[PDB]
Design a protein around this ligand. Sequence first.
Ligand code: 01S
Ligand code: CA
Ligand code: CA
Ligand code: ZN
Ligand code: ZN
Length: 158
Amino acid sequence: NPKWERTNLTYRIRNYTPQLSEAEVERAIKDAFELWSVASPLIFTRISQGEADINIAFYQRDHGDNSPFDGPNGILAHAFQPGQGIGGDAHFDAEETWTNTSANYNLFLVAAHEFGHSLGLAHSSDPGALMYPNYAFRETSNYSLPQDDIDGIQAIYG
Ligand SMILES: CC(C)C[C@H](C(=O)NO)C(=O)N[C@@H](C)C(=O)NCC(N)=O
Ligand SMILES: [Ca+2]
Ligand SMILES: [Ca+2]
Ligand SMILES: [Zn+2]
Ligand SMILES: [Zn+2]
């Protein structure tokens, strides 16, 4: 069970996707972290530069980690479990269409999914859970953590 033994975690958005504005990208990312926050003791702080616990980058194909991305559709992103260095980090395929809408793919929902992984959650078999292996759009306005996911971080932390 890898878990962060610290509660306030910093994150850094290393670059951006041209699909969305930077403000929309930053809002998608911020709201995704807030979901886990309201159900756990973790507090997340954005830093503009510098080492951050959770680095967030939009990369393409080979991007230095032995987990190359694959062009449109297919794998949308991946994150690493709690740890130093790459631990906790989250990469998004820069080749996907990232959206703010119901169109494929909504960055907020994919981000929320990746962060569960950065906090030490794996995939759930529950199709209604956010940690479900495959993406499905769900209304994002006043969006809240499904009970399955709530049970998962709460079993890791408090
Ligand atoms: C290549 C492996 C790690 C699959 C990858 C994933 O689950 N990352 O957490 C992924 O892109 N899964 C697809 C099926 C996806 O839509 N994931 C994000 C989602 N659940 O929102
Ligand atoms: Ca890290
Ligand atoms: Ca892809
Ligand atoms: Zn990667
Ligand atoms: Zn996943």
